[PDB]
């Protein structure tokens, strides 16, 4: 029976090392902000997966942790939002994110969606964030409240990262989305490896 | 002299039986570039047992005193050794060059299989290099004062003719030089890219580790060529204690790398625990 | 007159806290003094199960001490023969974020689930020689945290929807739902009867369900936060949880209080997985701090270590004869202990 | 409203009323037991090599 | 046994300007290894976070609206929380729960305006008006 053994082991292992080889060609991102909705797409002959959690009931505590090991977290962020503060609460959500335990090396690609309806808006923010009346940036009003978003986000990522992981913020087409997710993965890659050799 | 030479010794040897140990202990480090470092550990730890204790006999006797066979033998582990050290140094700047240059093919053109393959590849024109040339007699010169070398058993000179000195000294130093100074030159381009998109402290803090490995290989091993390669041109130009003492910083370049790639924080980690 | 019901529950709560401080002789550190200590506990790995490629979030043995299956979030459900080191089977699964698994009690199924909120019946045993898709269970509205078999044909699963539910396979119906937590259910545990079954959640406390008539018979609090493992005591007279709060805590069923409590200062950490030994008296309790503490669970006192992880012990299992105890990671490796 | 006081004090007195034993008989009984399979308990009990199907045959 | 207890008081009516002292209980856990919040929500509104504190007492966050009028405050001796809220305007008319974070030793907080996070209290009226 031991020889029936070996002969099952080896032909798993052929096909478990063909499923390695397939693993590591392709890189897992995490969409936030039935129970899971994937996507695939190819850019460059890369292949990326990208898995849509909604479908579970709003305390991410738990689950949030089973992307640990993924190339990035793309956080989406409404800049435009009975009228809650939703740009607080996104910040809270990116702040216990950049912070826990198991995503700290995990780079984030923010994306600051609906920027138009906010430049429709500011023509209300200055009641929350009332630094926003002092902010110089580094249409004016349009921009100046845009990177003070950006900058918010930023103030919250450049104080505890250690250079072990980053934040790629953009202003947000599938078409560009997609490309600049493929390209912040490689920058995400080639710092990894550049920190690795004390370069960075 | 006798104290320096055991001084080095004693450095080489703690060194890389330090790496080797470490890696072969932890999980956490048998990783695919602690693969290539292995080859570079068990190349300077051969140089530092064998070849570097009889030369230090050599320096202080002022001749050799173990018969023309072992002498032999000795220049031609020296060649393989050196040859090894300075192809792994190549080996291990191309894989870096690879994941840097090419992070996502880099997990596919880079496996365990390669590795291995890329290790023995190396081993093998290190020895094809040194031992077969060498002890067939291919090495020898036709100057009667080097047919009283090669016939005395007393002295082990290391008189060669062109043919030998120009091959070997291309396929131990010359090669893998050019092919580090491309790559880390990419690889500094890069790393400059890379700050940029981030943000000065930084760009000298890559400055200063690449300036610290090529420095050090170079200002440890370049002097010893050229004049490795001047010898069979101009016997009567370099004096013959200087070209001894070029081969000694050759040899003491071994005990430096174990500190320029095994200083990452699990490496010292391994090594607190194991002293 | 809402009033009443406030006082009904204001005047049954009192009761129910005078009935527990009376039934509280004395402390389990007491009756506990003289007995003898384990004596440290060394165990060293036997060995390295290695073919996974990511994290390993779940294992489960199979009820001949020799098999056992386990769950990568790469996405395979791998079927180790432990004697030999040998793949007996590697499963594709249809999705990869699994994060529970579960093995028939009479070795033909095994079930597998995760953030698909699905509980898929995978067949072992067919006249094709090749293991398929037997069954998939749905009706969950959040993850599926843990599953268990009580036979070949039923099944109960907890879920991150704060609720539990008893599954018919063959016709693959939800024949009964618990509900009562208000935290996410992160764990159950079927005791030695399968007619009970306690599960612990994200709101600090742990339930005790009757199978058959779908009630919730007792509830447990005392943890600080999430209780993320649970775990019967070999007879189900009792359980154990362990929490966030760095702590884990042994609680009665006949006495409806807290026994016992497993926690150091230098432990700042999560508890992550138990288990209890053949015998109960060892606890094994997987930490975030890469390492398994062994809890004398009759003193209190960490009666050893298990340290060979580089990264976070996500699931503990041992053996129904008690022989080995296996514990998977983040590393991706399953280690065999003795 | 109503409804969920209703099960507040439904659920609150289903588990009021049961037999409650003191803390001491569950010890005794916790201790009883894993002094009872002490044997039976190879971690806790380390046999030798020649009956682990995980060092010898 | 014993159980994860938030009990707000002093929560009361007030006249627009006026000024309030909201003193939370805590109960069943450590009140020094845990980070703590203020959230409130009014009609008809979901929930927000308004203040945290962390452990020691030292690191502080504030909610825009509130910065320059309201003072968390933290006492580990008496494991009380305090905020403090003078020049009160209407918009501040709610219920405030004192929350917690799930997990002790950490920086990050997460699920505390979830609408069913389990480490909240049962809250305190603020009512500002004639
Ligand atoms: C073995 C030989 C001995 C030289 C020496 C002379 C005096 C000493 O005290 C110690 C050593 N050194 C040659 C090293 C070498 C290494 C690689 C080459 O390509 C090459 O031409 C020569």
Redesign the pocket.
Known sequence: EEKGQREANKKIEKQLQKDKQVYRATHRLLLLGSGIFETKFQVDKVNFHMFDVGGQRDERRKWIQCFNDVTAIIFVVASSSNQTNRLQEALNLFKSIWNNRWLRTISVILFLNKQDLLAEKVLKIEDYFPEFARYTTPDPRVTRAKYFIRDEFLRISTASGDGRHYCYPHFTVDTENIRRVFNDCRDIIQRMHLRQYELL | MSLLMALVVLLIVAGNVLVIAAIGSTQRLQTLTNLFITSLACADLVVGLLVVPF?AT??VRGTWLWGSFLCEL??SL??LC??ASIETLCVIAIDRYLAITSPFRYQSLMTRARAKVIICTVWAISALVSFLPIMMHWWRDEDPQALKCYQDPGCCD?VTNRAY?IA??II?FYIPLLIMIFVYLRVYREAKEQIRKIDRFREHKALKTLGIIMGVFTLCWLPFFLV?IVNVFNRDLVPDWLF?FF??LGYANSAFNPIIYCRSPDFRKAFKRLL | ELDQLRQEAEQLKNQIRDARKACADATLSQITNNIDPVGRIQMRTRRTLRGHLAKIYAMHWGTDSRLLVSASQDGKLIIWDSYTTNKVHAIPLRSSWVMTCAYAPSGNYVACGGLDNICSIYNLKTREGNVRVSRELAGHTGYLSCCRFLDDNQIVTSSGDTTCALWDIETGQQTTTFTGHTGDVMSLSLAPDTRLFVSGACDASAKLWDVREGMCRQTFTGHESDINAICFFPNGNAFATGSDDATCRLFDLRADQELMTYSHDNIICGITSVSFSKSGRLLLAGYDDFNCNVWDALKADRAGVLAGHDNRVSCLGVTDDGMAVATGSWDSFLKIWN | SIAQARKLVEQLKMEANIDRIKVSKAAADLMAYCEAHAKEDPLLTPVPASENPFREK | AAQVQLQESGGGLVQPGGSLRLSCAASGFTFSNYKMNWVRQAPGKGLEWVSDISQSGASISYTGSVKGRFTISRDNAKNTLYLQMNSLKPEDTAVYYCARCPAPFTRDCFDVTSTTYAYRGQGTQVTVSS
């Open positions: 030369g050599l320096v000795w220049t020296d060649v050196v040859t290391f000195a070997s000294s131990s490795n001894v081969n000694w």
